């Protein structure tokens, strides 16, 4: 079970025992149930939650009808969560108090995008040779990519240059510092993937 969130930024606070704790602020916000999935119809149990208030200008007609059936105002982001203790119906509202009894949470996000990256940054390759001592033009080269005629191929899974970042990442077991229902705020110890303003999934 969990809720959708938005990353605000990082700060550092002082605990009760005088420890400087790095902290990520997350707006967890009121999530509305927009669909209940059941074993009989969908084949599995889950709840679909909507997070950020949208407008009819930015809601397509199919999604507008979906929200009309749910009898809620249109939402921008929808995500599914399973294993919800307690029954929830269509149009119910969940807030950051859902995490008021959790010591640790899981945060799923999309990491920052690096674009195309070479082997040195993407995979930590050591580079060919030294900066001097006869180096021509392979300071950031990969080196050899295989063996001789016996395999006569590059193996699948060989680490090469390519797109790095901008993908789904889960950070496990982040300690919860404080729940702030008056502002829908969640304070976690540590850092979470993505840039400020990205949408996060927070699982209990």
């Amino acid at each position: 079970p969990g809720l959708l969130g938005k990353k605000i930024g990082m700060t550092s606070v002082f605990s009760a025992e005088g420890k400087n704790l790095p902290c990520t602020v997350i707006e967890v916000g009121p999530c509305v149930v927009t669909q209940v999935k059941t074993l009989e119809k969908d084949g599995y149990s889950a709840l679909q939650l909507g997070f950020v208030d949208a407008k009819e200008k930015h809601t397509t007609k199919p999604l507008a009808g979906h929200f009309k059936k749910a009898n809620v105002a249109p939402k921008r982001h929808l995500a599914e969560f399973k294993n919800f203790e307690g029954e929830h119906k269509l149009g119910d509202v969940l807030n950051v108090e859902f995490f008021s009894d959790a010591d640790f949470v899981d945060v799923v996000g999309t990491s920052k995008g690096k674009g195309f990256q070479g082997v040195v940054k993407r995979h930590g390759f050591g580079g060919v040779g030294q900066a001097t001592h006869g180096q021509h033009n392979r300071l950031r080269a990969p080196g050899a990519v295989g063996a001789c005629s016996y395999p006569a191929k590059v193996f699948k899974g060989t680490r090469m240059a390519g797109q790095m970042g901008n993908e789904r990442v889960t950070v496990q077991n982040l300690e919860v510092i404080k729940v702030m229902p008056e502002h829908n705020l969640l304070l976690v110890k540590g850092s979470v993937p993505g840039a400020k303003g990205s949408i996060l999934l927070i699982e209990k």
Partner: protein, 121 residues
């Protein structure tokens, strides 16, 4: 941040003046040693009529680091030099005096006899 081939001042009244770090103890590929860490040293220079000989391999505990050290209360400390104190086989101070300040982290390193220090910071 002391590694192999780093030179340290010897901050006690034993004969050694300068020492060279041979190895940082504590695990495979352990790169750096900080305050309160135990290293192996080779003695590089001694005072005339010194108890310890030049070229003697010894153990030492790091007591001052130029690179800054972080404490859990959000504070940091850094020194102007890199200084160590020599130890015997039993793990005790080889000398009787300590010159200059030492880091407060040495209290918890089971190294309480460095309380000979003029000032613990």
């Amino acid at each position: 941040m002391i590694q192999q081939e780093s030179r340290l001042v010897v901050a006690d009244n034993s004969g050694a003046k300068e020492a060279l770090c041979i190895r940082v103890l504590g695990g495979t590929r352990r790169r750096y040693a900080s305050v309160g860490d135990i290293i192996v040293v080779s003695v590089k220079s001694v005072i005339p009529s010194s108890d310890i000989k030049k070229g003697a391999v010894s153990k030492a505990v790091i007591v001052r680091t130029k690179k800054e050290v972080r404490r859990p209360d959000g504070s940091y400390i850094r020194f102007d030099d890199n200084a160590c104190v020599l130890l015997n086989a039993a793990g005790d101070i080889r000398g009787s005096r300590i010159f200059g300040p030492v880091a407060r982290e040495l209290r918890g390193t089971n190294m309480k006899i460095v309380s000979l220090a003029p000032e613990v910071l």
